[PDB]
Amino acid sequence: GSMRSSIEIFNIRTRKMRVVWQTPELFEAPNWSPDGKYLLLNSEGLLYRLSLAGDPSPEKVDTGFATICNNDHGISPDGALYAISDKVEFGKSAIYLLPSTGGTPRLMTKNLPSYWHGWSPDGKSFTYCGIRDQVFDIYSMDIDSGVETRLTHGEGRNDGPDYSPDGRWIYFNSSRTGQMQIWRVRVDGSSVERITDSAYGDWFPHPSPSGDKVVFVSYDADVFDHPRDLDVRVQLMDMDGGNVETLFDLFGGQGTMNSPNWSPDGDEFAYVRYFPV
C-alpha cells in the first residue's frame, strides 16, 4: 500500500520539520501529550497513542463502547483525561471524558451534536462546537457541574474553539463575514473580535501554550466548509492577528490539525500531511 498519512512535527523556533510516522491508513488530528511523550491520533473511529521516543507504532486506546470517534478530541492539562466526540450512542457526535489510560466514557453533552475542541488551562472547563437546529455555536461546559454556556449566538456559523493559555479568550472561526475567518470571544462571552481578515477560509485555530502564536490552516476562498485532500497553507500569526505567515504548503485540510496540536513547550506542533489516493 502506498503512504496515505504522514504524521509530522514542525518546530516554529528553528523552522525544522520531522516525520514521526507514515502509514497507508488514514490517521487524523494529533494532540500532543502534556508530558511531551506521545501523540494522540484518531483513525477509522478509534483512538491511538504514538510514542515520540522508541516505537512510534500506534497503540490503540480503550475507549470502551466509543468506537466511532471523530477528529475532535483532546487531553486534559494534567494528562489524566481524554475528551472524545463519538456517535455510537445517539448516531451523532456526543462529547465524553475518559481516563487517559483507557476505560469507560462519561457523557458530557446531552444536546447534540457537539464537537469537542479545547480544554481550559485550569482543566475545569472545555469548549466545543454545538449545532442546534442548524445553528453552529461556541459553547463551554463546566466539567463538575455539567452546565452548558452558549458563547456565540448564531452570528454566522461558528466552529473550532480553543483557549488562549491565559484563559481569557477562546479563538474560533466564523462565517459571519462571508468566508471562514478567525475570531476570538472572551471566556465570559462578553466581547468578541475579528482576528483574521484574509482572502482565505481560515480554520482550526490553536493558540500556542507559550502565548505568542496561533497556528491555523487557510483553504482557498472558493472552498466550502473544510474538506479533505486539498492544497492548503499552514499559517502562523501573533495572538492579535499580526504578522501572518505561511509556514508551509500542504496537501490535506480535514485531519491535518482539527484538535489542539501544540507540544507543551509551545515551540512545536503536530500535524498530518496527506498524499493523494
Curated annotation (Swiss-Prot):
SUPFAM superfamilies cross-referenced by the UniProt entry: DPP6 N-terminal domain-like
S-S pairs: none
Pfam family, one: PD40
Family: Belongs to the TolB family.
Protein's UniProt name: Uncharacterized protein Atu1656
Organism: Agrobacterium fabrum (strain C58 / ATCC 33970) (Agrobacterium tumefaciens (strain C58))
